[PDB]
Design a protein around this ligand. Structure first.
Ligand SMILES: CC(C)(C)[Si](C)(C)OCCC[n+]1cccc(C(N)=O)c1
Ligand SMILES: CC(C)(C)[Si](C)(C)OCCC[n+]1cccc(C(N)=O)c1
Ligand SMILES: CC(C)(C)[Si](C)(C)OCCC[n+]1cccc(C(N)=O)c1
Ligand code: NA
Ligand code: NA
Ligand SMILES: [Zn+2]
Ligand SMILES: [Zn+2]
Ligand SMILES: [Zn+2]
Ligand SMILES: [Zn+2]
Ligand SMILES: [Zn+2]
Ligand SMILES: [Zn+2]
Ligand SMILES: [Zn+2]
Ligand SMILES: [Zn+2]
Lengths: 348, 352, 349, 349
């Protein structure tokens, strides 16, 4: 096919539309994938709600940074995969040559911004299209016979909480407690990860009893309703010792405040969710001694392989709702109104 | 609506600036050479809105005016001397009446009659009584085209929604061979038919341009090879699909200055731009280094009689799928309100 | 044949052309070397040399002359179809020869020439204003037989360009049709001759001078009226109010384009042939009659140039010429700028 | 490359084609050497090889193959426009390139080719049924991109020839028109697909074989009629009493031409594309409807070949092919002679 359907963000303030664009051809070192599943996440809405001044990803933009597909054509000199191999796309592309990239932590590449290296669906053409280009073979991770619909969320919904947990995993030994705030998209996977790679007790925190009920099924040992009573409730569940780690996937100021009120001495707060302006206040007597705080970014490539390994072993169960490519824009309206059970996935 | 006597219901423009109204007016009787039709379907056109929005100083079609220049019906009464049609024959109304005697008319191109203006010959619904009524007069048998057993609702838009794009395409059809690209701007009442015509009478690649995801999907449904969003990025998106070579012909059914601007930015050397949609003041700028060499531009008008016959032949062969919404005569004014807000999917059609 | 040759070149922006001594070119494979017998002057050369430093994109130094006629001097490797001594005219608007437009015989509308940097002689490539010139391919040579080269040089542009413009709508110009010619200078004077030879259309001329109107009548215009605000009414006066089938605007000013839009007939045509930067037709509803198409044509096709040469060889095309030597080249361009050349200037090396 | 190559040649009148070794050609200036990727064969080759020895004057030996496709292997001196590796189809009816017909983009109707001895490859010049082939000029190569060469080879004749015949009267084939196709095995099979792609004409297929008529319906024929004395009555029955706008007779027998004259419409057209020696239409008053033109078209133009390639690459043209190796060339011609090839045989060296 000389052209292909793609869900694109074409102008500021408008809804994404299904438009026809040229089918890309892989240059030297590139790989062309036939997309088999493309995930939607709230970060797409956040990007699409940016005003004209702040948005810096160029228009038009093919959406979709949660991509999985099969190798369709290999660019010149690309060995490592064969036509038909099922692969997941590593999102946070880096330069590959800086100290951070050499350590595997391409998500923390120190030259990507200066060089204009952007992830697919966030500056580079995304996965919500019949075909997509991947810049390099090192940004492809094999998935074997993993169902592509289940695999697509793993590239962000799985990778991002996995990285946040991995940053302080040595603290989550037996006897530790991990608090998960927001047990929807990412927190649901975070709970499953915590139970798989650690023996820590998991406390779920969310506004909706519906979300709390599911959190208990996937391993959460206790559930608390979000609000002004959450802090007291969490400490009541842990005596007065606090939570070794708090993974806030909401990112609102109120949830960060709850995290700072319950984190243990020498603990950790991970601000994963994004609410513009929300921030933790790290100062003496405003947070326990030794309790570190960070805003993590996506994850490393080796962590993506580990997330795939968890899924192939039956340890990650991602709730998905499938959509057609033509249903792409409709799916984003569904995501906007919070009417999607778990994760939305477009199957071209 | 069961026929009931010497008066008929009609949708009329009666005073400047007001909405049209349904009225019970006398049923006309055909004079010698004329034909009385029982109307079976009357289509709504955006040009009706343009006419009804003209100020008193500009409007020159007389009041009251029975609206509707998109008419099909059945022969009800033959005027004196009229042979060639029998009572009951299903016919489509050729709209752009001409004098029939000038050089243009002698070639069938009555839409370009050079004497109609001087003689006061005006089309039904645009100066003469239109088809949005139970009955209508047609001036001459040569302005009737048989439609056979075609469904009236689907046949009525053929007289303008089909005929007008068909004529614009026909003007440069020899340019639209295999390997050519035809750009269609607008997938409304006319554009969604133009796409189908291009697929049926040419091997050109068809790229549609519109705003709504619904319109772009409609374009693909009716046969467009590709569809892109209108606006500032439309020109680049088209040239991406053409490999930067430019479009052989651009058919602009919107006619806004921005869409004409896009047409000039994508038209190929020696190509064509057809400005079909009407926006007052909007115009192409045909000058050196403002448009590619040899790229011609025209504002076409309706179509020829032989073209209308060819449009009916396309419909009877199953090559035209006209999207319609049906209204009653009493709903006529409400239908025009729907047309104003652009909530009519395809073409609105009144069925007496 | 000497190793050096005389030529006239545009050498630096904003300055006048100068006479120079440059190496005589040698034809590579596929090319043909001509001994120039006449090189025509054209106002388009002034337009090119008036481009500011930034806007000019035709390269320096540039041997001028895009109206070239000569005799075959040396055949490049593999070139047949012409023999040494054959008198040929140089087809100007070189194309790639391989795109759909080129394959249809419309090289002037080649869709690849710009991308490939293919430019006409004298407008990017070495022109004809020199003792010798290189032609890239044999398909850009047209035989002229024993036709006087001074007469043939203007045919390559002054004849080909109006001929193409008329040819685009010739089927409209049957008996009873009317063709309006605005401007009876170089191209319009030839345009009238063409219209009389290939059609039975009534020709009405429009110009600004009593002398120009009288010239128009002499070359076959049935009527002539003065240009200006009253021009449109004056034409409609002669046509009985019917409007003109086609309008060929060889001036191209905004005022003449405006006139053309006021006189063109329903389902007619307007050809904007003259070049005035910024002037353009306004093609929209209520600003132009229904069905009246408008185009800016470009030069002409190769088969059209053959037909122009056939008209001239049959005694149906005459173009007033003034002759200059190569040394008088820059002088002739001074004359061209100040509009003091009657007809077309031709340089004879 | 090796100093010699295999070629399927017609070396003696009345003989069968044989695989012989001949020197590998080298491209002179302006020429292109192709490595052949596909060489189609058709009944025109059998007709040529059936010419009696009494009519033979010159031409032997002849490398067969006028339906050639290949990749550029070596560029002659001065040739630009293609690079080594480019996939190209060979335009068959070579012309002089300088006459009016050639300049108009109708080299198939070149008026100088016969006098100059310019013959098509495989029909007077070395054909494509060999490891390598010479093309005289770059303008006789048409790029095909990534189109399968085996699918491209038949289109150089089985596609181009019906496309040209239809194109000659395409403006007549509007909605409401009827096109009759006599002989739907090869050229007519592609002609049916062309008619459905470039027009809205109703297509009536006429043939002797019931299986070929079923295939005709599958590729766009609206009706099927048994060829014979009753075909004219059956065709009229299908069109009322109106007749067919155009009749494309790919058989060319006297009986089929007679049927064409009995069904063509007033002001219609009859295209005699197939060849049967001595068969002809009788164009005279009351022997054919008024205004119905008759012609024997020849092959097609280069721009038409580009359009045929465009149709094929868009998935709108399909002909069944059976591939043979170059060593099997004679076997392919044996199969063709006994009429057991479905679609088109293609030789792949
Ligand atoms: C990092 C950006 C500011 C560009 Si965001 C939040 C609009 O999404 C891109 C990566 C997707 N994702 C989603 C949720 C959380 C995170 C995270 N904590 O890294 C990342
Ligand atoms: C000087 C220009 C920039 C306008 Si130009 C590159 C189009 O002139 C040289 C091409 C010859 N010629 C001269 C006058 C008019 C025309 C025409 N109307 O075709 C063609
Ligand atoms: C040498 C032959 C006398 C057999 Si002849 C010119 C029919 O074949 C040429 C080869 C192409 N082709 C095939 C069939 C018909 C036509 C045509 N109608 O031109 C052309
Ligand atoms: Na637009
Ligand atoms: Na027969
Ligand atoms: Zn995401
Ligand atoms: Zn890096
Ligand atoms: Zn209308
Ligand atoms: Zn008239
Ligand atoms: Zn000139
Ligand atoms: Zn070209
Ligand atoms: Zn053949
Ligand atoms: Zn020739």
């Amino acid at each position: 096919g000389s052209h292909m359907k793609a869900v694109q963000y074409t102008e500021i303030g408008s809804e994404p539309v299904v438009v026809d664009i040229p089918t890309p051809t892989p240059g030297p070192g590139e790989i062309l994938l036939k997309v088999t599943a493309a995930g939607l996440c709230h970060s797409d809405i956040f990007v699409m709600d940016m005003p004209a001044a702040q948005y810096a990803y160029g228009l038009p933009l093919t959406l979709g940074h949660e991509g999985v597909g099969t190798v369709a054509e290999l660019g010149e000199g690309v060995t490592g995969f064969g036509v038909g191999d099922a692969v997941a796309v590593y999102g946070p592309w880096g330069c590959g040559a800086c100290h951070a990239c050499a350590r595997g932590r391409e998500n923390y590449c120190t030259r990507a911004a200066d060089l204009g290296i952007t992830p697919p669906g966030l500056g580079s053409p995304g996965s919500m299209a019949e075909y997509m280009i991947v810049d390099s073979a090192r940004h492809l991770v094999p998935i074997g016979d993993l169902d592509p619909v289940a695999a697509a969320p793993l590239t962000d919904a799985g990778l991002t909480p996995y990285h946040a947990i991995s940053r302080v995993l040595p603290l989550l030994g037996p006897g530790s407690t991990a608090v998960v705030i927001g047990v929807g998209g990412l927190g649901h996977v975070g709970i499953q990860i915590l139970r798989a790679v650690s023996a820590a007790r998991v406390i779920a925190v969310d506004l909706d009893d519906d979300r709390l009920a599911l959190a208990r099924e996937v391993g959460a040992d206790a559930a608390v309703k979000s609000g002004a009573g959450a802090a007291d409730a969490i400490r009541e569940l842990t005596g007065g010792q606090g939570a070794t780690a708090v993974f806030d996937f909401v990112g609102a100021q109120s949830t960060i405040d709850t995290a700072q009120q319950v984190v243990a001495v020498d603990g950790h707060i991970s601000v994963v969710g994004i609410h513009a302006g929300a921030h933790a206040k790290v100062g003496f007597f405003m947070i326990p001694f030794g309790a570190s705080v960070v805003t993590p970014y996506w994850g490393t490539r080796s962590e993506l392989m580990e997330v795939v390994a968890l899924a192939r072993a039956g340890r990650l169960d991602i709730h998905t709702e499938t959509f057609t490519l033509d249903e792409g824009p409709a799916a984003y309206r569904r995501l906007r109104e919070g009417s999607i059970r778990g994760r939305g996935v477009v199957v071209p």
